[PDB]
Amino acid sequence: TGEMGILWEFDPIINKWIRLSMKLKVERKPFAEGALREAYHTVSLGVGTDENYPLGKLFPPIEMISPISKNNEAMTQLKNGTKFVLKLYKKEQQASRELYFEDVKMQMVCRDWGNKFNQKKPPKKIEFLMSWVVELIDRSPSSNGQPILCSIEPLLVGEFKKNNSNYGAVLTNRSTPQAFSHFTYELSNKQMIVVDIQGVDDLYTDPQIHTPDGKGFGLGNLGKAGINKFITTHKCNAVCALLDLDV
């Protein structure tokens, strides 16, 4: 029968969240997992407005929410019938409400970096998937009393491959993922780096940002230690050279 959700989309260019609703039907058991999360096949039963579900203390704070939601990615990318992916944290105690929003914002920040990288006209352009926060409002808060939240994103079709980790592993020999990571480090004045570059070909998802202070950007932000680990194993390649990155 499916279930209702409040759907949150972040738009970096206005620095506001957009609040919508959707109906979805998720499989009972996950098809894959990572260190922190499990992934579930889901189907959209339609996207709508949040008009029927008022009040949305409060996080995000009201000043961070657009009162207008007419323009959004969800209504096309998650339209009725769309197969997509829902992710839950594994059995959690470290997962506050704010964390879910932090994760989704992080992926949106990485989309901005992908666009910036693409403006350099690299041999292979890249793209990060949209991600959204969903509040599964039909579910009981079967824990300490906290509502059930998750993130959702489009389904990747094809061979899912991880190219680097968030702690120095270089897992494939492809240039583009490693050059992108290096690009983010140099162009951010070493104030962040995007790693955990993974997905199907150059369509990526669940990246991870490190910043020197390790603040924000989720549980996987390993700070200077994570940045240095990337450096220890990074070998510049043909794409690094084309982008004139510091050797």
Ligand SMILES: Nc1ncnc2c1ncn2[C@@H]1O[C@H](COP(=O)(O)O)[C@@H](O)[C@H]1O
């Ligand atoms: N958008 C996606 N489409 C298909 N498979 C995915 C997607 N995101 C993650 N996966 C798979 O689910 C696992 C865990 O996802 P994550 O928690 O994002 O690392 C990954 O290692 C992939 O095998």
Ligand SMILES: [Mg+2]
């Ligand atoms: Mg993974």
Ligand SMILES: [Mg+2]
């Ligand atoms: Mg991550």
Ligand SMILES: [Mg+2]
């Ligand atoms: Mg952090």
Ligand SMILES: [Zn+2]
């Ligand atoms: Zn390099």
